Design a protein around this nucleic acid. Structure first.
Length: 32
DNA sequence: ATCAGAATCCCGGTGCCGAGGCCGCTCAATTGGTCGTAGACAGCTCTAGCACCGCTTAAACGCACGTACGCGCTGTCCCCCGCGTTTTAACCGCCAAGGGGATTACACCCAAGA
């Protein structure tokens, strides 16, 4: 059985929704 | 149409540092009184805004015809989409460099200061 693999476009929108719902700082603290 | 699959939301559960309630003053807010000038009100004016006519004309709309920018569809191969391996951004215990107590056996005698 071939392992699960999302088509190009699903995880992108998932990350869009996740980062639009949360307001945490996306840039790291020490490098900035 | 239909199922297997990893990804996502809500519920026991918990406790802790952030959110919330209380006390003493004391320095800012309040009261009362004396100056007082910038603000409210009346008056003159003429310039500036407003409405309308005479004569003029380049600007704006409808007509004629096609075309080239506008847009759907096709062939390609590409470089991101996504998973697996450590690693590089720091985080975390024993070497071989010196600073020091210790010694010069055991028992006895002589001399000379506080």
């Amino acid at each position: 059985k071939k392992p699960h693999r999302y088509r190009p476009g699903t995880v992108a929108l998932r990350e869009i929704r996740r980062y639009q719902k949360s307001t945490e700082l996306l840039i790291r603290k020490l490098p900035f």
